[PDB]
Amino acid sequence: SKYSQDVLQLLYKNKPNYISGQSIAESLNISRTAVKKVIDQLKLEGCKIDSVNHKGHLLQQLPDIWYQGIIDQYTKSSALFDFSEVYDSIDSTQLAAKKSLVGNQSSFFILSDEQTKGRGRFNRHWSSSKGQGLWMSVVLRPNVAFSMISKFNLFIALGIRDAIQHFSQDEVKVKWPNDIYIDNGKVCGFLTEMVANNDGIEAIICGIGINLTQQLENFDESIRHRATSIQLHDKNKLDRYQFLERLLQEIEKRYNQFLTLPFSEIREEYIAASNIWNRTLLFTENDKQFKGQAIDLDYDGYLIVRDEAGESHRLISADIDF
Amino acid sequence: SKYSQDVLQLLYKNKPNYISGQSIAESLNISRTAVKKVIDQLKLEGCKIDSVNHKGHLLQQLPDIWYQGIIDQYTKSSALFDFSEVYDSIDSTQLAAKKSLVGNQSSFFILSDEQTKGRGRFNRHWSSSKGQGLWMSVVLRPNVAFSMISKFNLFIALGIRDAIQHFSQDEVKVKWPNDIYIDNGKVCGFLTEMVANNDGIEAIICGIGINLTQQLENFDESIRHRATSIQLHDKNKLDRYQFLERLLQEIEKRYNQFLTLPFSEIREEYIAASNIWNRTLLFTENDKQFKGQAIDLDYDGYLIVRDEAGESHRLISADIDF
Ligand SMILES: O=C(O)CCCC[C@@H]1SC[C@@H]2NC(=O)N[C@@H]21
Numbered sequence: 001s002k003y004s005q006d007v008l009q010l011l012y013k014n015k016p017n018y019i020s021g022q023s024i025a026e027s028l029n030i031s032r033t034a035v036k037k038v039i040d041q042l043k044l045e046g047c048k049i050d051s052v053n054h055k056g057h058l059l060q061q062l063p064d065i066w067y068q069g070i071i072d073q074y075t076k077s078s079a080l081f082d083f084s085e086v087y088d089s090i091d092s093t094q095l096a097a098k099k100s101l102v103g104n105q106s107s108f109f110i111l112s113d114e115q116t117k118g119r120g121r122f123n124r125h126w127s128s129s130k131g132q133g134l135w136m137s138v139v140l141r142p143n144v145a146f147s148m149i150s151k152f153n154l155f156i157a158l159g160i161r162d163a164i165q166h167f168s169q170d171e172v173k174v175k176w177p178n179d180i181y182i183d184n185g186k187v188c189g190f191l192t193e194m195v196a197n198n199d200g201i202e203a204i205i206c207g208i209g210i211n212l213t214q215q216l217e218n219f220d221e222s223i224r225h226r227a228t229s230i231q232l233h234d235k236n237k238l239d240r241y242q243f244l245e246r247l248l249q250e251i252e253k254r255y256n257q258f259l260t261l262p263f264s265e266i267r268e269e270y271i272a273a274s275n276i277w278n279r280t281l282l283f284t285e286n287d288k289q290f291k292g293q294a295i296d297l298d299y300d301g302y303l304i305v306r307d308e309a310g311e312s313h314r315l316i317s318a319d320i321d322f
Numbered sequence: 323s324k325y326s327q328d329v330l331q332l333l334y335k336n337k338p339n340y341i342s343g344q345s346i347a348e349s350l351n352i353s354r355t356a357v358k359k360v361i362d363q364l365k366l367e368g369c370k371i372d373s374v375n376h377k378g379h380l381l382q383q384l385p386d387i388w389y390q391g392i393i394d395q396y397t398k399s400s401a402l403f404d405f406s407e408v409y410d411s412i413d414s415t416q417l418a419a420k421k422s423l424v425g426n427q428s429s430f431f432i433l434s435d436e437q438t439k440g441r442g443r444f445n446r447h448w449s450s451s452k453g454q455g456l457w458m459s460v461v462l463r464p465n466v467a468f469s470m471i472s473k474f475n476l477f478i479a480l481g482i483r484d485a486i487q488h489f490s491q492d493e494v495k496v497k498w499p500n501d502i503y504i505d506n507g508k509v510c511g512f513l514t515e516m517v518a519n520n521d522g523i524e525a526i527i528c529g530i531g532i533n534l535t536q537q538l539e540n541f542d543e544s545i546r547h548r549a550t551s552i553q554l555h556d557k558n559k560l561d562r563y564q565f566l567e568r569l570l571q572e573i574e575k576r577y578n579q580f581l582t583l584p585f586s587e588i589r590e591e592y593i594a595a596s597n598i599w600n601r602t603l604l605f606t607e608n609d610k611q612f613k614g615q616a617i618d619l620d621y622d623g624y625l626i627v628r629d630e631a632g633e634s635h636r637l638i639s640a641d642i643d644f
């Protein structure tokens with residue numbers, strides 16, 4: 001409805017306290033009896049609101065839907081993001097982001113419940129079902145030379161890992177350069193792209209897909225043995241609005257780190273985090289395909305690999321399989 | 323009008339021959355007497371059409387307006403470009419291009435008679451008056467690593483130079499890395515940007531502004547001593563549709579060269595072309611500003627400079643003043 005969001009906003013801003021139909025009706029400037037329709041609807045949409053007589057309304061729990069109104073609260077308190085955009089379904093949050101960044105310098109992010117044409121690295125299909133995962137592109141505006149994309153990718157990786165870790169009983173590791181794993185289920189994939197030129201970057205557009213609320217039965221086939229959600233490694237229910245909040249919090253931390261520190265400082269931690277050593281790796285390079293071993297990550301973000309034929313390579317990027 | 327373009331198309335396709343109101347009327351499937359309005363209008367818009375009784379209509383000369391219909395002919399015969407877009411006025415042909423490239427792989431270009439918000443390097447204002455200059459962004463899809471932007475810039479430079487040269491009595495030189503000069507008037511500036519990621523470029527978007535039909539009196543102030551048009555170095559009238567045709571022809575040649583040759587091969591020619599040696603240069607780098615001498619362009623597109631304090635720099639890019 002026309003007013004739904006503003007209602008949800010007031011409801012949210014007012015926790016841990018109740019507020020009266022009355023009090024809402026004065027703010028939004030609409031009938032006491034319209035606020036009831038709006039509420040009776042929000043509940044029907046799966047909202048948990050406690051309504052008690054004489055006292056009013058308290059927002060208890062939100063469903064697995066993103067609401068522009070409440071996501072406005074995050075953008076508001078943010079010291080990073082100007083605005084956000086929220087859709088229930090779009091073609092792709094990266095495509096949207098790439099459109100929205102032109103002729104302005106805003107930092108911002110875009111969430112969508114469902115993607116109908118979401119892609120990953122190399123333009124692989126990316127599965128993005130309604131109400132199941134956080135599908136989001138983020139735009140930032142670092143003031144750096146274009147060479148520095150690679151580092152961003154590494155820092156953010158730890159942001160996305162921690163955010164996810166704080167919610168997982170099992171250990172969450174990073175599979176360089178782009179994937180986040182819990183055990184041998186890929187929980188999230190992310191991708192960093194830039195608009196840039198000869199001297200200075202115009203924007204960064206990091207697209208992030210994390211699987212939130214998936215049962216084993218939801219995946220297939222046969223990805224079911226190398227894909228896992230967050231929920232499947234957390235005894236208690238996973239709150240999408242709570243995860244968002246830490247994810248954004250960590251994305252920020254790691255952005256600033258990126259902005260003020262050379263990699264070396266992060267390096268040793270990134271190692272503790274990676275699950276690529278002491279196992280055979282499966283590298284692809286256009287027509288060519290080979291095996292090899294991850295030996296080390298050097299100070300510049302590059303991966304030092306020993307291919308099965310004994311030769312040493314120093315790689316900026318790669319796509320790797322277990 | 324609704325049909326104007328299709329008329330102009332037939333008119334153009336039929337040179338050096340006349341064609342009858344009749345013959346047009348059958349193709350476009352409209353009254354013989356509507357074709358007359360369309361023609362009487364095209365003339366009034368500054369078209370030169372010869373109409374003789376019993377014989378018909380011949381397209382003699384086009385004004386200083388771009389027409390989507392005739393520009394369709396170039397895109398059609400092209401072995402490079404899928405389509406084009408033509409506007410009489412837009413915000414910026416780069417902005418437009420950056421929007422139009424998303425979620426597709428088309429190669430294409432965009433022309434506009436006037437820009438209301440056209441920018442150059444570092445987001446400097448770029449003057450783009452109606453009917454006076456070729457204002458165009460071009461999109462290509464090379465299949466190369468993102469590092470290779472720099473080279474593209476160098477090759478295209480010679481394309482844009484030759485295209486312009488064939489029309490100038492005075493010698494046309496390239497001021498590395500982005501400007502085209504005739505004597506000490508900047509005739510054109512161009513800029514190469516990319517959308518790309520860790521492994522592979524998504525698109526190139528080279529934006530090109532060349533001054534076509536400017537009198538000294540049109541410029542100011544006081545750019546009038548370091549800016550010059552093409553027309554001011556050509557005794558005979560400059561045809562915007564004829565220049566476009568060679569420009570596109572050269573852009574293509576030089577693109578293919580880029581695609582199949584290392585720089586070294588172009589290098590020595592690029593030198594004959596540059597007007598940066600044996601004079602003092604004025605380099606800017608963020609807060610810092612210094613003098614120096616252009617000593618050489620090495621095989622990798624980099625400029626070897628000797629700053630006034632005797633130190634040697636190897637530069638990928640720079641902004642330079644005379
Ligand atoms: O291929 C991968 O390794 C990761 C793909 C990352 C996809 C995310 S989902 C949200 C955003 N929208 C997209 O189109 N892609 C990113």
Ligand SMILES: O=C(O)CCCC[C@@H]1SC[C@@H]2NC(=O)N[C@@H]21
Pocket residue numbers: 414415416417439440441442443446448450456457458459500501510511512513529530531532
């Ligand atoms: O600053 C320079 O040195 C050159 C500027 C190049 C501007 C051209 S004009 C057509 C296209 N549209 C733009 O916004 N810029 C390029």
